[PDB]
Amino acid sequence: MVQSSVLGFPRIGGQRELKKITEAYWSGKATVEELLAKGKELREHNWKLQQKAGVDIIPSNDFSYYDQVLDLSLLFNAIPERYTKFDLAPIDVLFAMGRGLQVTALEMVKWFDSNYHYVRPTFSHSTEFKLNTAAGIKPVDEFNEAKALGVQTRPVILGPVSYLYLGKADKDSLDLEPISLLPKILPVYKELLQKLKEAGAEQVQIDEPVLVLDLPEAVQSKFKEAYDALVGADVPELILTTYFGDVRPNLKAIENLPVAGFHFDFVRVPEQLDEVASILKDGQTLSAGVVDGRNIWKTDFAKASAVVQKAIEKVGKDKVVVATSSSLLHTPVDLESETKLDAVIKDWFSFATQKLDEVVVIAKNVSGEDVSKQLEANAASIKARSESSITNDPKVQERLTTINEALATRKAAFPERLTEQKAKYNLPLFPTTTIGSFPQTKDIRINRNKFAKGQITAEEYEAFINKEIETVVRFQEEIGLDVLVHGEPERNDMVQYFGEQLNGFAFTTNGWVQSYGSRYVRPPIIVGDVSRPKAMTVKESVYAQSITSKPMKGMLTGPVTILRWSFPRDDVSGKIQALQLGLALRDEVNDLEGAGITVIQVDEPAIREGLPLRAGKERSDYLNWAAQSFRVATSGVENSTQIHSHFCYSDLDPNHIKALDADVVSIEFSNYIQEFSEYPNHIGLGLFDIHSPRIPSKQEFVSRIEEILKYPASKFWVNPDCGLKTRGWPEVKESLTNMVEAAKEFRAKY
Ligand SMILES: CN1c2c(nc(N)[nH]c2=O)NC[C@@H]1CNc1ccc(C(=O)N[C@@H](CCC(=O)O)C(=O)O)cc1
Ligand code: MET
Ligand SMILES: [Zn+2]
Numbered sequence: 001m002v003q004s005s006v007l008g009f010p011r012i013g014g015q016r017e018l019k020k021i022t023e024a025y026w027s028g029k030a031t032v033e034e035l036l037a038k039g040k041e042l043r044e045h046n047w048k049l050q051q052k053a054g055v056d057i058i059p060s061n062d063f064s065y066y067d068q069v070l071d072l073s074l075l076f077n078a079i080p081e082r083y084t085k086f087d088l089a090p091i092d093v094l095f096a097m098g099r100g101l102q103v104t105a106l107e108m109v110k111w112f113d114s115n116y117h118y119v120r121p122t123f124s125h126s127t128e129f130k131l132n133t134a135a136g137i138k139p140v141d142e143f144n145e146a147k148a149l150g151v152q153t154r155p156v157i158l159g160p161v162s163y164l165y166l167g168k169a170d171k172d173s174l175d176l177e178p179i180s181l182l183p184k185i186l187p188v189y190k191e192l193l194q195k196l197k198e199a200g201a202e203q204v205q206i207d208e209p210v211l212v213l214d215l216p217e218a219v220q221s222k223f224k225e226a227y228d229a230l231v232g233a234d235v236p237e238l239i240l241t242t243y244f245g246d247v248r249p250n251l252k253a254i255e256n257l258p259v260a261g262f263h264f265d266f267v268r269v270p271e272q273l274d275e276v277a278s279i280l281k282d283g284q285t286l287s288a289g290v291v292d293g294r295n296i297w298k299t300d301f302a303k304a305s306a307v308v309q310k311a312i313e314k315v316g317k318d319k320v321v322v323a324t325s326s327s328l329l330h331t332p333v334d335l336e337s338e339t340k341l342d343a344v345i346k347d348w349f350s351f352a353t354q355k356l357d358e359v360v361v362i363a364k365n366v367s368g369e370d371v372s373k374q375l376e377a378n379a380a381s382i383k384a385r386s387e388s389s390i391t392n393d394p395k396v397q398e399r400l401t402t403i404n405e406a407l408a409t410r411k412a413a414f415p416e417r418l419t420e421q422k423a424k425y426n427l428p429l430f431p432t433t434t435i436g437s438f439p440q441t442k443d444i445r446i447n448r449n450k451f452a453k454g455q456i457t458a459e460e461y462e463a464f465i466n467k468e469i470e471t472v473v474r475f476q477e478e479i480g481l482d483v484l485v486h487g488e489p490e491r492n493d494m495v496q497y498f499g500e501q502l503n504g505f506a507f508t509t510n511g512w513v514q515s516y517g518s519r520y521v522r523p524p525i526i527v528g529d530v531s532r533p534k535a536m537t538v539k540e541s542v543y544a545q546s547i548t549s550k551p552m553k554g555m556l557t558g559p560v561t562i563l564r565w566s567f568p569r570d571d572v573s574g575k576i577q578a579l580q581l582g583l584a585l586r587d588e589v590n591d592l593e594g595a596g597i598t599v600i601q602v603d604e605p606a607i608r609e610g611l612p613l614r615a616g617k618e619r620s621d622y623l624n625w626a627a628q629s630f631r632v633a634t635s636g637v638e639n640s641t642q643i644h645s646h647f648c649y650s651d652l653d654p655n656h657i658k659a660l661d662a663d664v665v666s667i668e669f670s671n672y673i674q675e676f677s678e679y680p681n682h683i684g685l686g687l688f689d690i691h692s693p694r695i696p697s698k699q700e701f702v703s704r705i706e707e708i709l710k711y712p713a714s715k716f717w718v719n720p721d722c723g724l725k726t727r728g729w730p731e732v733k734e735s736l737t738n739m740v741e742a743a744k745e746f747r748a749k750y
Helices: 017-026 032-053 068-075 090-099 138-148 160-166 178-198 222-230 248-254 270-278 301-315 352-367 372-387 394-401 414-425 442-452 458-479 538-546 559-564 574-594 617-634 654-660 672-676 698-709 729-747
Strands: 003-005 108-110 117-119 154-158 203-207 237-241 261-265 285-291 320-324 503-506 513-516 519-521 525-531 553-557 599-603 642-647 664-668 682-686
Touching: 003 352, 017 032, 032 138, 032 352, 068 090, 068 117, 068 138, 068 154, 068 160, 138 154, 138 178, 154 178, 160 178, 160 222, 178 222, 222 237, 222 248, 237 285, 248 270, 261 270, 270 285, 270 301, 285 301, 285 352, 301 320, 301 352, 301 372, 320 352, 352 372, 394 525, 394 574, 442 458, 458 538, 458 729, 525 574, 538 553, 538 574, 553 574, 559 574, 559 617, 574 599, 574 617, 599 617, 617 654, 654 664, 654 672, 698 729
Parallel strands: 003 320, 154 203, 203 237, 237 261, 261 285, 285 320, 553 599, 599 642, 642 664, 664 682
Antiparallel strands: 108 117, 503 525, 513 519
């Protein structure tokens, strides 16, 4: 009979219990031991959930108070000195490294192309790798905890190659190649596996996801070295686990490994099956990832089963395992918590708890068990979705056909646009602006709330918001910034604010996923053809513009970001989703401009995140369609309308930037500048860091603009890295005057 397997379970709790206890711990409200007690409770409950569902292979060590990579960093001693001389207990060294100390946290990084973030493994020349008993041995201890409940588990750890390859050298050891520490770390993994074996762990899931990445040959040889060194009689069997993409270009690196088996992701790349199956040795098992670990759609049991059967056919039923494609970390906990969803819609979904039942049902179906009831219920749910008008919008379909060159091209090229814009706005050289969001007051939320419970009227809350915009615009004026923003006080998440106002979307009350730390998101879901029925942002920008003579930036989140930070449709391409969004946002841009908001900025903070993980056709089509969707949203406007675009990734492919043809591009950027020397359009290389205090001076700033001018001055805007939502009013006062005053100097040197 075919076994079922789960690669990881989200640990936040059905009621966000993990957030509340960890936050209460950090803020003094809860003891360390009450923190450990909620932990056990969460693990117990999640193990029990999986046992009761009937999952055969059940993970342990997937739990974490913060980040699983960090947990491994704590466990192997990759713990820089600075964190060590504050007498912090190791759990508190944990929290120091992740979320800093009144010392900066270690770097947060995007975990592949998910919207989960991990803590960078950081390594020095001095780093000595060892297990530490007295800190407890997390994977061993949690494996023992589950065994005592009568639940045998499979520890999950990130393998050595991936762990090293994703870490970076610390400041003090700049010249180090992390890959090179491989001899130094294998012994420690060995010893950990020895101790997991002693405890009674028979199998271990060893994550090597960097196999789905373009790897240098020199890095590929390291799998044979690493795994030759780990496998043995004194250790558990190893299931080398990959997810999120296609391992075929690295197939040679793993075709003669002494591991007991492999896992691959056949949701994201079903087509790799045949090749990866072909290299299985006698005895090695194949874990077939066929229940999506990253999206929330009810699995098609017939198609998933046919994927598993294709593997059975190549390899034999006793050597295949039905699996989630990745850890379920990236999905919400429990659909049954959703109180507001239409039952028709809810019938399309499965969250992490429902996905447990899916891998069990799928395993049974391919085992030969009659599960024809479930298959029929499932087939009925799938058939209903693919017919619903909630997904069939004939107007949007027709509008898609109208997409062409003209529709993604401005009426004139930038040099001609600049003339009409200099006349219309007559901005001074070194124009000063900001990215959109400012610090926010307590009256805000209470006012939002009162209007939500019906306490104040729409024509009470609308005035509370305009006063807050008025406060924000008045401040900028006296400060003397040239192009202004409204502060975004009417706004929640920069995506949900748009999703709620767009057809084709649904929202959850409890669909929470961990983004980083104790900090969670509740992404919108795209269920169908998207359109914009009416004005989303116009009223607030029209009000801010009516109160001042200065040009007011309207403010949009771009189509790629709305797509990437939502759960997408899996029955249509990302691309098609992005272009529907481009067209809906086009209507918004047009209404904005129509209302006299003729400066408009578009934020695409998720452009890099959606980048296909391998270079190739998929990567360059993405850049073409990512750019194309942006241009479809912004190209209907007059030559005197000024289009801005903001980015948070500093290493953003210059050519993608040029491909947008924004009048102005603002980019986080505290050489490369030269790529734009002969590109006409204007650019504000973000001159300073939005994520900390320390208000820089005239010459802090000043040195910058000369150092950047070492790029022509006719094209330079002065602005920070991002919005200031994450800061306070005092530190914002000076920064911005110091910023402006700095600009005024150059400006008044011509
Ligand atoms: C700008 N970022 C961002 C994103 N993804 C989304 N969807 N939204 C974002 O703002 N990815 C990159 C980064 C992630 N950072 C964050 C930062 C804060 C919160 C946050 O404010 N979380 C709150 C609840 C949010 C709410 O109530 O709407 C929390 O306390 O968990 C989420 C993600
Ligand atoms: C995260 S991108 C910038 C978004 C928005 N304009 C802000 O200033 O907050
Ligand atoms: Zn930004």
